[PDB]
Amino acid sequence: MKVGQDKVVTIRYTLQVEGEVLDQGELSYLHGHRNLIPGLEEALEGREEGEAFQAHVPAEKAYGPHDPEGVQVVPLSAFPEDAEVVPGAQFYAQDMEGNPMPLTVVAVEGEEVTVDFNHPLAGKDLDFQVEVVKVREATPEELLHGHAH
């Protein structure tokens, strides 16, 4: 079976950014439903089970470019009393629909904390080594939910 619209595809992968492996493992996803970064999904289109390959995915087809609007300055009083507010530390605010908005602390200057709401890989080009482990048809429930079980 080939990778295609409405297939649930299982891959084993290694994610490299700038010559360093950042993540490694296995995932399954419903193909053609915006469940996987588009560059990788494009590289997977039409592949057979058992196929292995490498794929370079520029930032625009991966987690997207770095959005300057994602960088903001907030007061230190915005953070929990106990928290260590340091570069790299992660937290979340809430969007207008009540959902979590993760952020990373970028810099702390006295009372001014610069945070970044961007995906940590936004604006980075990715390199994948991929193996297609399994391809199957989605169940109706998976199509209704929009994701692999």
Binding site: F79, P80, Y92, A93, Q94
Partner: peptide
């Protein structure tokens, strides 16, 4: 007077 935090640990 201390402001209600709008940033949460996770």
């Amino acid at each position: 007077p201390k402001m209600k935090p709008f940033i949460f640990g996770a």
